[PDB]
Design a protein around this ligand. Structure first.
Ligand SMILES: [Zn+2]
Ligand SMILES: [Zn+2]
Lengths: 115, 114, 57
């Protein structure tokens, strides 16, 4: 289609065809220890995890004291026109429901989602 | 982020969890020496790998007779007007054509990029 | 012979001039790549674009 003419649609189908894994869009990861979701060992993630916490869902059996924190690079994120919403559903939809992902808002400069 | 050695048998202290006070405990698997964790984090994995080699280059490189020298950029910490510059000469050579300098004055060893 | 392998005085000067100007341009390219002022092209490492344009020159 006109995708053969304009470079933008060519580049979007380019990114849509190329294979992309997770370690290409991550900056660093850290395994913390929050025995309570209100503990928030790292200093500043308390805001968004809390604004989730006043809407608390899925406290079915326990709360796992073990946490996994992932940091993302918006450079590698936007170049493929990705944002952590689709990642968030597919990292859940595709592996099971044994994991649970809460995330920031992209207006914040660094893109972190905790599991 | 570091490592912990046992105080009795000098081995590697593993992290463990106790269901009483919700605190990280470091335990041994030869004896059972115990203590609590001060930073309460275990694993970290840096994938960006953007470590600035200003923390890895040595000050005695200014004794090398096979490196170029300069009279333009002087040293800030001592005011010497002679430096010796080079490249990264390591991995992470995707866009690695920076130019680290080292002062050549004896007992200055000041290093700086630009 | 060797009379057929030699040139006049004017041509030698022209060759020297063009060689000098090329060796000049290469130096500007190098010294502007040492201040991180080069921008890689799509699908090209920084080393790749540097060497590509110096090979062009
Ligand atoms: Zn021990
Ligand atoms: Zn100095």
């Amino acid at each position: 289609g006109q995708s053969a003419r304009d470079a933008e649609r060519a580049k979007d189908i380019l990114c849509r065809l190329e294979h992309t894994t997770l370690r290409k869009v991550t900056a660093n990861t850290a395994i913390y220890y929050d025995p309570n979701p209100q503990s928030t060992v790292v200093a500043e993630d308390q805001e968004w995890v809390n604004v989730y916490y006043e809407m608390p869902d899925f406290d079915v059996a326990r709360i796992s004291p073990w946490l996994l924190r992932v940091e993302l690079d918006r450079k590698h994120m936007t170049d493929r026109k990705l944002t952590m919403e689709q990642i968030a559903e597919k990292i859940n939809a595709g592996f099971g429901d044994d994991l649970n992902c809460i995330f920031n808002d992209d207006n914040a400069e660094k893109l972190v989602l905790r599991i | 982020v570091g490592i912990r050695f046992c105080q009795e048998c000098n081995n590697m202290l593993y992290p463990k969890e106790d269901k009483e006070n919700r605190i990280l405990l470091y335990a041994c698997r030869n004896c059972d020496y115990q203590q609590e964790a001060d930073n309460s984090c275990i694993y970290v994995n840096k994938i960006t790998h953007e470590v600035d080699e200003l923390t890895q280059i040595i000050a005695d490189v200014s004794q090398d007779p096979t490196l170029p020298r300069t009279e333009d950029h002087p040293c800030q910490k001592c005011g010497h007007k002679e430096a010796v510059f080079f490249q990264s000469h390591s991995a992470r050579a995707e866009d690695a054509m920076r130019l680290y300098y080292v002062c050549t004055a004896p007992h200055c060893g000041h290093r700086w990029t630009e | 012979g060797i009379g057929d392998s030699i040139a006049d005085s004017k041509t030698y000067q022209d060759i020297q001039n063009t060689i000098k100007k090329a060796k000049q341009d290469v130096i500007e390219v190098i010294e502007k790549a040492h201040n991180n002022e080069l921008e890689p092209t799509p699908g090209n490492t920084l080393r790749q674009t540097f060497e590509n344009q110096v090979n062009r020159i």
